[PDB]
């Protein structure tokens, strides 16, 4: 719903512009056409144009790309949400936790492996965990059919 969400429709209505496929409304300020002022601040000779400031950018960044925004009820949309990567399982026979082949393998070709400062020497290999200490859910299965 980037630029097809509630706040972007509000900004489009406020700016009197329309998102392709969005709703279209009667002009909120009836005379925004008055930018035909021929003042030098807007002068097409002085501006450098590379890709035209199309209305998506006016909605995406309402305050950098528009005038009058103290009188216009322009609204910020939520900027980004970190994209969810849950892939739906096709097969009920798979484990619930399995390395799906759409997940890239965990490798990088040229990283040095970090130094593992493990305990060493004869006195330290003999260290034993007591007989009752046991992983916190050892007998619980890692996953069920649910």
């Amino acid at each position: 719903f980037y630029l097809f969400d509630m706040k972007s429709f509000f900004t489009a209505k406020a700016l009197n512009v329309a998102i392709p496929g969005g709703p279209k409304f009667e002009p909120l300020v009836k005379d925004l056409h008055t930018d035909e002022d021929w003042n030098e601040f807007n002068d097409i000779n002085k501006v450098i144009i590379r890709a035209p400031i199309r209305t998506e950018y006016r909605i995406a960044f309402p305050f950098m790309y528009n005038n009058l925004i103290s009188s216009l009820p322009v609204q910020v949309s939520w900027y980004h949400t970190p994209s969810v990567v849950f892939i739906k399982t096709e097969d009920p026979d798979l484990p619930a936790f399995y390395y799906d082949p759409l997940i890239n393998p965990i490798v990088l070709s040229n990283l040095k492996a970090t130094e593992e400062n493990l305990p060493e020497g004869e006195e330290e290999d003999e260290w034993e965990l007591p007989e009752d200490v046991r992983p916190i859910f050892e007998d619980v299965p890692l996953y069920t059919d649910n």
Partner: protein, 48 residues
């Protein structure tokens, strides 16, 4: 993450079950944009 430290040190601090509290995003534009825009300090006493 700071929301958790806030929740631990402030008994009345509310975290929604389904939205981040973002206590340190105090600006309303940070509330709306959903991202931290300006740094906010938080001084707390915490036990190790």
């Amino acid at each position: 993450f700071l929301d958790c430290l806030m929740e631990q040190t402030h008994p009345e601090f509310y975290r929604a079950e389904d939205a981040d509290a973002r206590f340190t995003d105090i600006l309303f534009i940070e509330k709306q944009r959903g991202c931290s825009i300006k740094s906010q300090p938080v001084s707390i006493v915490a036990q190790d």
